[PDB]
Amino acid sequence: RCTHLEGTTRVTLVLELGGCVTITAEGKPSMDVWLDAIYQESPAKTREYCLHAKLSETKVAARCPTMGPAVLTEERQIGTVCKRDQSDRGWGNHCGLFGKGSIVACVKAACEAKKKATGYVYDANKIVYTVKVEPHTRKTATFTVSSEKTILTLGEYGDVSLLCRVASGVDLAQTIILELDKTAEHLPTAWQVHRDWFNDLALPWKHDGNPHWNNAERLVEFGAPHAVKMDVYNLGDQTGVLLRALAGVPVAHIEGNKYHLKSGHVTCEVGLEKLKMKGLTYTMCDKSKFAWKRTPTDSGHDTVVMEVTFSGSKPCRIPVRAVAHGSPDVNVAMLITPNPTIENDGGGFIEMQLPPGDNIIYVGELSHQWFQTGSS
Amino acid sequence: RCTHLEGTTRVTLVLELGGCVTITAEGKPSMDVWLDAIYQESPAKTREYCLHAKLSETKVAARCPTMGPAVLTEERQIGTVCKRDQSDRGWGNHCGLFGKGSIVACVKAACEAKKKATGYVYDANKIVYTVKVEPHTRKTATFTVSSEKTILTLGEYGDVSLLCRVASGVDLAQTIILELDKTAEHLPTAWQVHRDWFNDLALPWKHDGNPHWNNAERLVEFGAPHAVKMDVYNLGDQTGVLLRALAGVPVAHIEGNKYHLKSGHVTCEVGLEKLKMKGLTYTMCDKSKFAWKRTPTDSGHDTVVMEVTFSGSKPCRIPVRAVAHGSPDVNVAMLITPNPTIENDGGGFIEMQLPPGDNIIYVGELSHQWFQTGSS
């Protein structure tokens, strides 16, 4: 989704992620600046939620309705879920006093492999921004909060200054990359969610490395007790629940160590007074020896694009122009490619804006017509 | 949860499932009637929902923004999920006309093994009821809608007539047993849910045997397309979702072919004029040669229970009585065990109601005191 930005010597841009900006000044080469990616490498873990429990064999203890308290070894340990209630005992048991007794049911909870959900948070002091200037509608500039000014030496075009204010997006406090462990299936991984949401999840969690699990009763549920017994059940794989919650929330991307934001912008102050044209020593190309490689067609982003073959004298400068019907002697071609030059290796593609109506585009002598639709 | 039902010759009962009813008439032996189970063997399947999808390798086709329609072999087949939209093509592709193109992404959907959820429905004409009379606070009587009257020959006690009106519970139209396939874990199976709910589930389903799956887009979701590609994702195992929905809904029980209801009642017209006592030819036991096997203790269900050892002449009839303090010569023992007789094999357990206050219970000469708490 490019945006054009037609001269003075300084420009201010808001480069949003996934956004192209073709800046073009009178008498200067046009160039494409676009915030490529905002990332942080190996951020800090906050929590690891468990999407699927894994329960040991249940241990149940129980005693009579007046004296005996029920005790177990899974009691007073770490990493177990326990519960205790009525038991409705009597003489059918070996519990001679009729009445309501004491139970306890305990299960050692653990988390099954590859069923973690890890949450990573962002430190602004450690985030990197990529800007990537390129000519005629490539070099990369890395920015941090701590370094936000860089001079790019665009080969044989000149020098471009970039002072890119790091405008943090969602407050990097609020932001969490949610990464699932790579289940063998083909399902998404690493959404970008809000911290206040991520911490408010009804799933067993812990801290990175902590050998035991917190709030494991959220995936374990017990049954009614029968005088010596009480059933314990697992609530099964929660991956479906989480994917339901994460419906439509966009998937953030990860290149190994690099964790990406899918939000945020950067405000760059592009200084373009040190850059030069492609070259004006060139003699004009033979006005006749052209042909169309590709007809003038819509750029899609409101300009007109085309490519031409030149079967004559190599490096030279192209005589591009356009006319509006009725005034054949005024030029209406507003070239986005400012000085199209056909070169040794090849190339020589032309882009221009045209006023609405019928126009005739002349590349030397090669003519072709275009209808630039009215504003819409 | 027994209920006592203290004479005439006919009784009407509402026996609810999980409910004991101790019917006792003057001069007749007391007996326990209880609806044991309501079931139907191998009922009809309605639907099989899929809790976890299983997607083939995606096939993606795409063509240019003016002419080419996108087609595939997974199109015009059965058991696939497909979708098609914009594609934003141009010259970076091999798609020379700039503009928005045509896509299609198709995946063969199947259901993973042991991830079915089957729904069984009840035909009233095929449901069986069990009633199970037994003496002194065992024989089984089977009832259907089509046969609802049976004479039980309680050995040496007599004959009991049972006319049990089959009062269908939840309209067996509305009722569905939900059975999960036996996942290796220890998790519940076979809830009893309502049909209007069971059919309103956002899961892929089919009919018993149907080789392909309906509405498989409910577990499959696609991504944004990039000019030749468009990602397809699985929503993972839904077992967690269903167990969340089924939180607290009681688990119905299954004995192989037998599927159980956990609701419903039966209205039985117990006829008890053909049953006789344990035996009154017996000479009274030696009023002295007794001892307590188990002290008079609360029945829990508002009566008093006890057991006695007799070290003397075998089969005989026990002289049980009770007195309220202040009137030592009136009998207040309201025996639920009407004619306690100590027998050869053993036994001879006594149950009685007592008026509130201090009472003294006399088994022959063996005395023991009891405090029957006031009404509460």
Side-chain angles (χ1 to χ4, degrees), chain A residues 1-75 77 79-207 209-294 296-376, chain B residues 1-75 77 79-207 209-294 296-376:
Chain A
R1 277 72 177 270
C2 291
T3 300
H4 291 87
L5 202 143
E6 284 81 359
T8 317
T9 60
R10 185 186 297 118
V11 168
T12 299
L13 300 177
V14 172
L15 306 175
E16 291 191 356
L17 186 61
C20 159
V21 173
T22 299
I23 55 177
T24 173
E26 193 266 331
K28 298 293 184 183
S30 305
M31 63 278 295
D32 295 330
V33 179
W34 73 88
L35 185 66
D36 187 0
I38 293 172
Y39 65 90
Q40 177 180 355
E41 290 195 358
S42 62
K45 293 183 180 181
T46 50
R47 294 184 183 179
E48 296 180 355
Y49 289 101
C50 182
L51 305 174
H52 190 190
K54 190 173 181 179
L55 297 176
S56 71
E57 294 299 327
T58 304
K59 293 288 178 68
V60 178
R63 284 182 180 270
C64 276
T66 186
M67 72 289 200
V71 58
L72 287 174
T73 60
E74 289 83 0
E75 300 181 358
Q77 287 184 357
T80 58
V81 177
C82 297
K83 183 178 180 180
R84 60 192 292 162
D85 65 355
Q86 51 188 354
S87 182
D88 283 333
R89 295 178 64 86
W91 285 357
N93 317 118
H94 309 292
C95 198
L97 196 282
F98 272 98
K100 185 177 289 295
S102 174
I103 325 161
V104 65
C106 290
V107 178
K108 291 181 181 179
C111 190
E112 189 176 2
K114 300 294 185 290
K115 297 293 183 180
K116 293 179 187 288
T118 306
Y120 299 91
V121 294
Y122 283 87
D123 188 0
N125 294 114
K126 296 191 282 184
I127 281 181
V128 181
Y129 288 172
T130 297
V131 178
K132 286 183 178 177
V133 183
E134 181 185 4
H136 77 83
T137 179
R138 184 179 296 177
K139 288 182 98 290
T140 300
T142 288
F143 286 101
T144 73
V145 176
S146 301
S147 173
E148 63 189 7
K149 192 257 182 63
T150 300
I151 305 295
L152 286 175
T153 305
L154 292 176
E156 75 180 359
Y157 289 106
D159 294 332
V160 183
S161 70
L162 299 177
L163 191 148
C164 291
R165 184 183 70 86
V166 169
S168 300
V170 177
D171 192 5
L172 300 168
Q174 291 292 109
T175 295
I176 285 177
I177 295 296
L178 185 63
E179 177 180 357
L180 297 178
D181 297 336
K182 291 182 180 180
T183 301
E185 287 176 351
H186 182 70
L187 82 165
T189 304
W191 300 263
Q192 178 181 0
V193 301
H194 281 170
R195 178 183 57 189
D196 49 359
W197 179 65
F198 176 74
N199 288 317
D200 294 331
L201 284 172
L203 293 176
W205 56 271
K206 71 185 181 69
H207 303 289
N210 188 357
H212 290 90
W213 290 97
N214 290 324
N215 298 118
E217 75 271 16
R218 296 174 183 175
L219 296 180
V220 178
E221 65 187 1
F222 297 6
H226 306 281
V228 287
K229 305 289 182 67
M230 182 166 70
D231 286 330
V232 173
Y233 303 110
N234 186 356
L235 273 72
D237 192 75
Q238 303 289 320
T239 304
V241 175
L242 193 65
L243 293 175
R244 293 287 179 86
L246 296 170
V249 176
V251 293
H253 295 87
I254 290 172
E255 181 176 359
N257 48 5
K258 301 177 179 68
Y259 298 14
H260 284 276
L261 291 176
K262 298 285 101 173
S263 178
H265 62 272
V266 175
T267 63
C268 294
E269 185 169 357
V270 175
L272 70 173
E273 69 181 1
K274 193 66 71 68
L275 47 84
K276 287 90 166 63
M277 294 300 298
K278 179 66 172 67
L280 279 70
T281 64
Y282 293 167
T283 60
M284 289 293 180
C285 295
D286 190 359
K287 186 171 72 175
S288 63
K289 293 190 283 186
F290 281 104
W292 289 110
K293 187 190 267 80
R294 186 88 272 279
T297 189
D298 188 0
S299 175
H301 297 98
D302 195 77
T303 58
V304 177
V305 298
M306 66 190 77
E307 287 186 350
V308 293
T309 297
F310 185 70
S311 64
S313 297
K314 294 300 181 182
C316 58
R317 183 171 64 243
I318 300 173
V320 178
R321 56 183 286 276
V323 295
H325 281 83
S327 298
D329 202 349
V330 62
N331 189 1
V332 300
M334 289 180 280
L335 289 173
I336 302 304
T337 303
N339 185 357
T341 64
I342 194 68
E343 289 291 329
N344 290 316
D345 57 0
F349 95 107
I350 306 164
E351 178 177 357
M352 67 179 74
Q353 290 182 354
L354 290 173
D358 284 331
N359 305 115
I360 300 173
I361 302 166
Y362 290 99
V363 178
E365 293 177 355
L366 179 61
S367 66
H368 186 276
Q369 190 166 359
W370 181 259
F371 184 78
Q372 185 64 38
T373 45
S375 293
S376 298
Chain B
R1 277 72 177 270
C2 291
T3 300
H4 291 87
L5 202 143
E6 284 81 359
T8 317
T9 60
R10 185 186 297 118
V11 168
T12 299
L13 300 177
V14 172
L15 306 175
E16 291 191 356
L17 186 61
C20 159
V21 173
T22 299
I23 55 177
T24 173
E26 193 266 331
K28 298 293 184 183
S30 305
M31 63 278 295
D32 295 330
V33 179
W34 73 88
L35 185 66
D36 187 0
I38 293 172
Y39 65 90
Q40 177 180 355
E41 290 195 358
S42 62
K45 293 183 180 181
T46 50
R47 294 184 183 179
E48 296 180 355
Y49 289 101
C50 182
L51 305 174
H52 190 190
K54 190 173 181 179
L55 297 176
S56 71
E57 294 299 327
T58 304
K59 293 288 178 68
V60 178
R63 284 182 180 270
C64 276
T66 186
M67 72 289 200
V71 58
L72 287 174
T73 60
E74 289 83 0
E75 300 181 358
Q77 287 184 357
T80 58
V81 177
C82 297
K83 183 178 180 180
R84 60 192 292 162
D85 65 355
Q86 51 188 354
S87 182
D88 283 333
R89 295 178 64 86
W91 285 357
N93 317 118
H94 309 292
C95 198
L97 196 282
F98 272 98
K100 185 177 289 295
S102 174
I103 325 161
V104 65
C106 290
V107 178
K108 291 181 181 179
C111 190
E112 189 176 2
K114 300 294 185 290
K115 297 293 183 180
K116 293 179 187 288
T118 306
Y120 299 91
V121 294
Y122 283 87
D123 188 0
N125 294 114
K126 296 191 282 184
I127 281 181
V128 181
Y129 288 172
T130 297
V131 178
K132 286 183 178 177
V133 183
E134 181 185 4
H136 77 83
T137 179
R138 184 179 296 177
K139 288 182 98 290
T140 300
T142 288
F143 286 101
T144 73
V145 176
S146 301
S147 173
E148 63 189 7
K149 192 257 182 63
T150 300
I151 305 295
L152 286 175
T153 305
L154 292 176
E156 75 180 359
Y157 289 106
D159 294 332
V160 183
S161 70
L162 299 177
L163 191 148
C164 291
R165 184 183 70 86
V166 169
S168 300
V170 177
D171 192 5
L172 300 168
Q174 291 292 109
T175 295
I176 285 177
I177 295 296
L178 185 63
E179 177 180 357
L180 297 178
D181 297 336
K182 291 182 180 180
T183 301
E185 287 176 351
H186 182 70
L187 82 165
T189 304
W191 300 263
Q192 178 181 0
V193 301
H194 281 170
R195 178 183 57 189
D196 49 359
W197 179 65
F198 176 74
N199 288 317
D200 294 331
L201 284 172
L203 293 176
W205 56 271
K206 71 185 181 69
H207 303 289
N210 188 357
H212 290 90
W213 290 97
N214 290 324
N215 298 118
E217 75 271 16
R218 296 174 183 175
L219 296 180
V220 178
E221 65 187 1
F222 297 6
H226 306 281
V228 287
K229 305 289 182 67
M230 182 166 70
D231 286 330
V232 173
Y233 303 110
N234 186 356
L235 273 72
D237 192 75
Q238 303 289 320
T239 304
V241 175
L242 193 65
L243 293 175
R244 293 287 179 86
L246 296 170
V249 176
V251 293
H253 295 87
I254 290 172
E255 181 176 359
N257 48 5
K258 301 177 179 68
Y259 298 14
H260 284 276
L261 291 176
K262 298 285 101 173
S263 178
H265 62 272
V266 175
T267 63
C268 294
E269 185 169 357
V270 175
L272 70 173
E273 69 181 1
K274 193 66 71 68
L275 47 84
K276 287 90 166 63
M277 294 300 298
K278 179 66 172 67
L280 279 70
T281 64
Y282 293 167
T283 60
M284 289 293 180
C285 295
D286 190 359
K287 186 171 72 175
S288 63
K289 293 190 283 186
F290 281 104
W292 289 110
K293 187 190 267 80
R294 186 88 272 279
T297 189
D298 188 0
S299 175
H301 297 98
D302 195 77
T303 58
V304 177
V305 298
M306 66 190 77
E307 287 186 350
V308 293
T309 297
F310 185 70
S311 64
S313 297
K314 294 300 181 182
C316 58
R317 183 171 64 243
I318 300 173
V320 178
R321 56 183 286 276
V323 295
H325 281 83
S327 298
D329 202 349
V330 62
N331 189 1
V332 300
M334 289 180 280
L335 289 173
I336 302 304
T337 303
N339 185 357
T341 64
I342 194 68
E343 289 291 329
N344 290 316
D345 57 0
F349 95 107
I350 306 164
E351 178 177 357
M352 67 179 74
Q353 290 182 354
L354 290 173
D358 284 331
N359 305 115
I360 300 173
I361 302 166
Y362 290 99
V363 178
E365 293 177 355
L366 179 61
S367 66
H368 186 276
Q369 190 166 359
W370 181 259
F371 184 78
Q372 185 64 38
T373 45
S375 293
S376 298

